Each structure stands twice: as C-alpha cells, then as structure tokens.
C-alpha cells in the first residue's frame with residue numbers, strides 16, 4: 011500500500027494523454043515505489059482561457075497534483091501558469107518557446123524542457139567564434155521576444171562585438187530606413203530576431219536594397235525560417251531548428267522522467283506536505299511547493315530522449331540541440347548541429363548569400 | 368433613459384445598508400462572495416454575467432490577498448467587462464495589466480508609492496538607505512523610480528545596496544540571511560508581499576536589523592488589512608495606506624457605480640451605442656472579433672460631483688489621498704501623516 015502522488019498534465023490530444031499515462035507507468039516500473047507511487051491525471055487544452063483555468067481547478071488541483079506538465083496548445087500556458095502559480099504548484103512547459111515564460115515575477119513556478127527563442131543567441135555566438143565574425147549588426151523587433159534575444163546576445167558579448175543594434179516596430183512593412191542604416195556600416199554579418207510575418211518584411215526590403223547578395227551573411231533563428239518567412243528568405247541564409255522542439259511525445263517522456271526523479275528525491279526529505287485538494291475555499295500556497303521547485307530546478311537527467319536535461323537560473327532548458335540550417339537553391343539543407351555545447355559541421359558545404367564569402 | 372446592470376461584489380463583512388446610501392441609468396445588485404480562490408471568483412462573476420447581463424463590476428474585499436488583482440485583471444480582459452477594484456486585495460499593486468484589460472483600481476501605483484517613500488525620507492533627512500525587494504511584479508519599476516528620482520535630486524541621496532530575494536525557493540541554505548547581512552543602512556525600503564515580508568522580517572530580526580537605528584519603509588500591500596498585524600512585523604514600521612479611514616466603503620461603491628454609469632452614458636451619447644454585456648464566459652473565443660475595450664477611454668476620465676475620479680495609464684487612481692501609518696508599541700497601526708497632492712504633511716517633526 012504506497013502513497014499515491016499525482017502528476018497532472020494539459021496536453022494536445024488523447025494520444026498524448028495515453029503517452030503521458032504510459033510515461034508515468036514506466037517511471038513506477040523503473041523506480042522503487044513501495045513508499046510513493048505516481049498517478050497520471052490529465053486533460054487536453056480548453057477552447058478559451060477561462061475554461062482552461064477552470065479545468066486546472068476541477069480536473070487537476072482537485073486531484074492534488076504535485077506538478078503540471080503543459081504542452082503549447084495546437085490560447086497559451088498562462089492560465090495554467092497563473093492557477094498553478096497561485097498555489098506554488100510547479101509547471102513544466104514542454105513546447106512553449108516564448109521568452110516571457112522565463113519571467114520569474116509573473117511565471118513564479120515554471121520550468122521548461124525546451125529553451126526560449128532568446129537562447130539561440132548561444133548558437134550565434136559559437137557560430138561567430140567559429141567563422142570569425144567579430145563585427146555583427148543585430149536587427150530585432152521591438153517586442154519582448156526581440157529584446158530578449160538582444161539582452162541575451164549582448165550578455166554573451168560582455169572578442170566578437172555587435173557594431174550596431176537596430177530595433178523596429180512589429181508590424182512595420184517598409185523597413186528600408188532601418189535597413190539603409192544597416193547597409194551604411196562596415197559589418198556585413200546581419201543577425202535577425204523577428205516573428206515569421208516581421209521576418210518576411212525585413213527579407214523583402216533587404217532584397218530591394220540588394221543586401222541579400224554576395225558580401226552579406228544572414229544569421230537567424232527558427233521563427234525567421236518558418237512559414238511565410240521561408241518564402242521570401244534570401245538564398246544562403248543560416249537558420250536554426252531546435253531538434254525535437256515540436257515533439258510533444260519526446261518532451262512528455264523527458265518531463266515525466268525528470269518529475270518522477272524529483273518526486274522520489276523530494277520524499278527523501280522530511281515533513282513533505284500534500285498540495286491543496288481543489289481550488290474552492292483554498293487561498294493558501296502549498297508549503298512544500300517552494301522546496302519541490304528547488305529540487306526540480308537542480309534536477310539533472312542525462313539519458314533524456316531530447317538530450318541532457320538540466321535547468322538554468324530561470325528554470326529554462328540547458329544543453330538543447332539545434333540543426334544549423336542553410337537555404338541552398340530555395341531548399342533548407344542542414345549543414346551542422348549545435349550538440350548542446352559545441353558546433354559540429356557536417357559534410358554538406360555552406361553556400362553563403364552568393365557563393366563562398 | 369435605458370438601464371445598465373452593475374454588480375457590486377463584496378467579499379467579507381460589510382454594511383449593505385450603509386452601502387445602500389445622464390444618458391443611461393444603473394440597476395445595481397449587491398452580491399456577497401464567500402471565497403477568494405481563482406475558481407470561486409471566476410465562477411461567481413461568470414454566473415452573474417449569465418443571468419443579469421452586467422455592464423461592469425464593482426469589487427471590494429477585506430483580504431491581504433493581492434492576487435485578487437491578477438484574477439480580476441484576467442476575468443476583465445477575457446470577458447472584456449469593466450472591473451473596479453475599490454478596496455482590499457483587488458485594489459493592490461499588480462503585474463502589467465493585459466493589453467485587453469478593463470481593470471481599474473482605487474489604490475496608488477508602484478511609482479506613486481515609491482515617491483511618497485522618498486518624500487518621507489526628504490522630510491526627516493533620511494538620505495542614506497538600501498532597497499530590498501522580492502520578485503513581486505514591478506520590483507524593477509520600484510527600484511527604477513527611486514533611482515531616476517534620486518539621480519536628478521540636487522540632494523545627497525546615497526543608495527547603499529539593492530537586494531533581490533528569491534522567495535519561490537525554500538530557504539534551508541540560509542541564502543536570504545546571508546543577503547540580509549549585507550545591509551548596513553539606517554533606512555531600508557522593502558518591496559514585497561505581506562506574506563513575503565513576514566518571512567523577511569523574521570530573518571532580519573535574527574541578523575539584528577529590526578531594532579533601534581533601523582527604519583523600514585514599506586508599500587500599501589505589506590500593511591494590507593491594518594487589523595491583521597503579523598507578530599514578525601517590527602514595531603516602528605512605516606507604511607503608506609489608502610485612506611480606509613475617510614474614504615469608506617459606501618463612498619467607494621457610489622464612486623464605482625458613478626464611473627461605470629458615466630462611462631456608459633458618454634459612449635452612448637457619442638457613438639449611439641454601448642458594448643453588449645456578453646452572457647457567457649464559455650463563448651469568449653467565438654465572439655472576440657465583435658468585442659473591444661472601447662469603454663476604457665470613457666472609464667479613465669470620469670468626473671462626478673466635481674470629484675475627479677480619473678485613472679492613470681496603468682489603471683491605478685490618478686490622485687489618491689494616501690495615509691502614512693506607523694506600527695506602534697501596542698502593535699496597532701497609527702496615522703502619522705497624509706499625502707494629498709504632491710505634498711506630504713506629517714504629524715511629527717522628530718519621531719517618538
């Protein structure tokens with residue numbers, strides 16, 4: 011007769027709900043569960059935020075969950091983050107890449123198995139070191155996301171330096187004033203941080219200003235080589251792709267493995283209190299919440315499906331792996347991988363805007 | 368004139384009888400709410416919408432539960448219904464309100480309070496100080512306000528230290544204690560929640576920082592319900608409070624009803640329409656292309672009985688008459704000053 015410790019989840023589909031139920035089962039199989047045994051509790055995303063918040067209370071907090079796994083909906087993890095945060099119940103983001111969830115003030119008990127987009131600056135930095143791009147021009151959107159990338163790239167740079175940083179208003183379709191300012195500089199390495207629709211805007215104007223050809227280097231993230239951004243992207247661009255970043259199944263495995271370990275680690279300590287049973291009539295935080303957060307934050311699982319799972323000072327994923335993509339003859343060709351710490355070039359040659367620098 | 372449905376939600380003990388004392392007319396309904404958790408508040412407001420068809424909500428509570436501001440902002444933006452946090456946890460300082468928010472609070476802002484704190488310091492020539500914040504939303508806006516104010520003052524202010532305490536983790540390692548030992552200033556400005564402040568103070572006492580020669584200035588939310596005084600609060604603690612004394616609950620409810628009614632009358636007598644009170648919280652996704660926060664331009668600058676009830680760009684009251692309070696020996700909050708209009712009027716020249 012062990013103690014049943016529930017783990018909650020807000021997932022995309024019933025297949026994903028079954029994958030979660032299996033991941034938890036396997037965890038119980040692989041751990042010593044005489045004392046504590048896990049139980050999966052889950053729901054799929056609700057049509058709207060009010061219904062989603064209500065679902066967390068009715069379906070998960072009602073079951074006294076110790077943590078809630080959240081996949082990015084096919085709507086945001088925020089109603090989940092706020093409801094769970096209210097009680098200090100940790101939330102594990104599986105596919106949310108937006109840098110705002112790294113905000114400890116608003117998202118006060120949140121960890122993610124995927125890094126925020128701002129973390130691609132770690133790859134660009136290694137790339138700059140490798141190709142000896144000591145002078146760069148950084149173009150960012152004047153939104154939380156764009157500033158997150160700047161703030162992060164700037165941190166790594168403070169060797170290689172950013173000659174100028176240019177911010178633009180999200181939704182601006184004519185950026186030839188921004189891009190002409192960039193063309194005047196000696197630096198020909200342009201780094202871009204912008205949403206798919208804003209990346210398109212930059213791409214079109216840069217082409218009109220003949221800045222997408224030989225001489226220039228375009229270094230970019232995942233969003234900027236996705237959807238409409240890819241239709242107007244200059245041939246020779248360098249983009250990124252977070253390996254398994256959209257694989258909710260791989261992230262369910264890994265999050266459960268991590269949570270299962272942390273639960274068992276937690277119960278090695280004394281005076282572990284249960285979370286509140288439901289929302290109604292409960293306005294007190296879970297006293298064990300903050301300790302369980304510390305335990306999770308400091309958890310390492312190296313044999314994860316998506317790699318070495320570790321969390322940074324913001325509970326964001328460390329040692330994420332990316333595909334270094336190069337647009338060659340309007341085809342997205344992988345030219346290497348950022349393995350979590352090092353750049354590994356593959357036998358496919360990089361074609362730079364034009365030919366070879 | 369046509370009628371508008373206004374719901375007055377009152378969490379806790381209230382004199383409903385005392386409380387019961389244009390182009391459109393209000394049809395008010397006093398609602399008593401028992402619980403303040405997310406489910407209860409979301410459910411209560413949603414059921415009221417479902418029956419009466421509510422043009423706006425006037426909310427008041429007796430709690431030290433500042434999350435009610437967040438819950439109410441969330442409800443407000445999702446349903447696109449005006450909500451006025453007229454007292455308690457609902458009127459306390461918050462994170463950045465939603466782009467689509469229609470939440471307005473009777474309390475003072477982060478930056479307003481921060482200035483009031485420096486005004487107290489200038490008065491008693493308390494120029495040497497430190498700041499200690501947690502991650503509570505706006506902590507950077509608080510530090511930045513002080514810093515900007517300080518760096519343009521031809522006064523000899525000296526901000527010795529700025530501590531950032533992570534309260535989201537367990538303090539078994541004694542990290543907070545080691546950080547608090549860094550403090551050397553006679554004046555400490557503490558920005559955090561009432562719950563966080565009780566822990567911080569228990570620690571600060573261990574390190575001998577709550578005693579004589581150490582003064583702690585704190586914002587409205589740390590004092591909160593002046594009738595709930597944590598034992599760990601230091602005697603001689605200075606705080607800002609929104610005048611629960613002279614701006615009593617019935618006046619606030621009346622002013623809340625006035626704001627919604629005026630705003631609605633204005634939009635009607637200008638656009639020949641008002642926003643339709645949506646009868647569901649479970650259809651928000653479907654009908655958002657039909658809804659907007661248009662009423663905010665009318666809600667933000669209402670004047671009634673000559674009293675200027677206008678709100679800031681961030682949804683806090685524009686001109687609040689704040690009250691400076693001191694936690695005395697009999698562990699009770701005492702009035703020691705007033706902040707009316709850019710000017711501070713204190714009780715004492717020298718503190719006893």
Ligand SMILES: *[C@@H]1O[C@H](CO)[C@@H](O[C@@H]2O[C@H](CO)[C@@H](O[C@@H]3O[C@H](CO[C@H]4O[C@H](CO)[C@@H](O)[C@H](O)[C@@H]4O)[C@@H](O)[C@H](O[C@H]4O[C@H](CO)[C@@H](O)[C@H](O)[C@@H]4O)[C@@H]3O)[C@H](O)[C@H]2NC(C)=O)[C@H](O)[C@H]1NC(C)=O
Pocket residue numbers: 317318349350351352
């Ligand atoms: C991402 O890619 C990096 C780069 O390759 C990987 O890091 C290397 O990982 C390997 C294997 O774990 C490490 O190899 C071991 O190196 C030891 C000596 O290391 C020193 O020298 C290297 C090179 O100059 C430096 O990089 C390093 O910092 C040290 O100063 C050897 O002692 C080891 O040999 C023993 O074990 C091997 C098997 O592991 C046996 O074959 C041997 O016979 C022997 O008993 C071994 O060669 C290497 O040190 C790591 N390099 C760095 C930079 O840290 C990451 O592992 C990879 N990550 C992922 C997720 O794939």
Ligand SMILES: Cc1ccc(Cc2noc([C@H]3CC[C@H](Nc4ncnc5[nH]ncc45)C3)n2)cc1
Pocket residue numbers: 063089092093095096097114115116117118405434435437438439441462501502503504534560
């Ligand atoms: C749908 C819904 C919406 C709102 C609510 C209430 C709520 N509970 O949590 C939150 C978040 C908002 C930011 C807030 N951060 C902090 N609150 C207190 N003390 C703190 N210290 N450091 C940071 C901090 C937590 N909101 C619940 C459900």
Ligand SMILES: *[C@@H]1O[C@H](CO)[C@@H](O)[C@H](O)[C@H]1NC(C)=O
Pocket residue numbers: 257259260261263315
């Ligand atoms: C997603 O990850 C799982 C491993 O957990 C695996 O079954 C599947 O092959 C992966 N999907 C893709 C597209 O590779």
Ligand SMILES: *[C@@H]1O[C@H](CO)[C@@H](O)[C@H](O)[C@H]1NC(C)=O
Pocket residue numbers: 401
């Ligand atoms: C709230 O408390 C009062 C106490 O008299 C009670 O009558 C009322 O039924 C309670 N509300 C609910 C929702 O049950």
Ligand SMILES: *[C@@H]1O[C@H](CO)[C@@H](O)[C@H](O)[C@H]1NC(C)=O
Pocket residue numbers: 668669
């Ligand atoms: C405030 O309201 C009055 C209503 O008489 C209006 O004339 C004035 O222009 C408004 N001010 C602003 C800044 O909108």
Ligand code: NA
Pocket residue numbers: 038039040041042043
């Ligand atoms: Na087992």
Ligand code: NA
Pocket residue numbers: 112114117118119120121323324325326
């Ligand atoms: Na975090």
Ligand code: NA
Pocket residue numbers: 344345346355356357358359360
């Ligand atoms: Na290659």
Ligand code: NA
Pocket residue numbers: 639640
């Ligand atoms: Na009309």
Ligand code: NA
Pocket residue numbers: 655656657658659
């Ligand atoms: Na709309």
